[PDB]
């Protein structure tokens, strides 16, 4: 479970600040509402897929969890890699997702809770 500023710093080190034009506060806001900053978060979807990790990346498209029929593994990783204390796999897969044409609208919590808001508040006070 990251602190806000700790996660901001880790995301910046791993290349998310202004990635595909999304400022760091967007990514921190998305992680807050997707996972509560918890790398171990998992949530099953209605359709049988599961969302994994700090950015709740979905097994329907992005990772293999062994139990999501007809799904793809576009990030080429086990979904468990998205639960690690090390956010590298989540960041690298999120870079692919955000590049795929719909930007951060892929993250429902971002669209509904971060988009259009003062996202820079999420990085206030942080040494990065
Ligand atoms: Cl802290
Ligand atoms: Cl920001
Ligand atoms: Cl939402
Ligand atoms: Cl500190
Ligand atoms: Na999959």
* CA of residue 39 to ligand 1 center, whole Å: 15
From the candidates 17, 34, 47, 118, give the one annotated as an active-site residue: 34
Structure tokens at 77: 């990783």
Residue 77 near residue 64 (C-beta atoms within 8 A): yes
State the structure-solving technique. X-ray
Q: Measured between alpha carbons, how far is 32 from 29 in angstroms, rounded to an integer?
A: 5
What is the rounded distance in angstroms from the CA atom of residue 7 to the CA atom of residue 37? 8
As to burial, measured by CB atoms within 10 angstroms (0-12 exposed, 13-18 middle, 19+ buried), residue 92 is middle
Domain boundaries, the chain: 4-123
Contact call for residues 20 and 101 (beta carbons, < 8 A): no
How many Å lie between the centroid of ligand 4 and the Cα of residue 127?
7
Contact 13, 5 (CB under 8 A): no
**For the stretch 58-84, what's the b/e string if a residue is b when 16 or more beta carbons lie within 10 angstroms of its beta carbon?**
bbbbbbbbeebeebeeebebbbebbbe
The residue annotated as part of the active site, out of 51, 65, 86, 118, is 51
115 C-alpha to ligand 3 centroid (Å): 11
The CATH number of the structural domain formed by 4-123 is 1.10.530.10
Contact 1/85 with Cβ under 8 angstroms?
Answer: no
Residues with a beta carbon under 5 angstroms from ion ligand 3: 108-109, 112
Residue corresponding to tokens 């955000």: 98
Separation of 54 CA from ligand 5 center, angstroms? 17
Contacts for 22 with CB less than 8 Å, ≥ 6 apart: 16, 98, 103, 104
CA dist 33 and 99 (Å) reads 21
Would residue 6 show up in a list of annotated catalytic residues for this protein? no
Per DSSP, 64 falls in state: B
Between CA 106 and CA 9 the distance in angstroms is 23
Torsion of CA 36, 49, 61, 110, to 10 degrees: -30
**Declared resolution, Å:** 1.1
């Amino acid at each position: 479970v990251f602190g806000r500023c700790e996660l901001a710093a880790a995301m910046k080190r791993h290349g998310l600040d202004n990635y595909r034009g999304y400022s760091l506060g967007n990514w921190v806001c998305a992680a807050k509402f997707e996972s509560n900053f918890n790398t171990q978060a998992t949530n099953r979807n209605t359709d049988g897929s599961t969302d994994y990790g700090i950015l709740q990346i979905n097994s329907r498209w992005w990772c293999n969890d062994g139990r999501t029929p007809g799904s793809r593994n576009l990030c080429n990783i086990p979904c468990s890699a998205l639960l690690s204390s090390d956010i590298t796999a989540s960041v690298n897969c999120a870079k692919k997702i955000v590049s795929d044409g719909n930007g951060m609208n892929a993250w429902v919590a971002w669209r509904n809770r971060c988009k259009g808001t003062d996202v820079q508040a999420w990085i206030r006070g942080c040494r990065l």
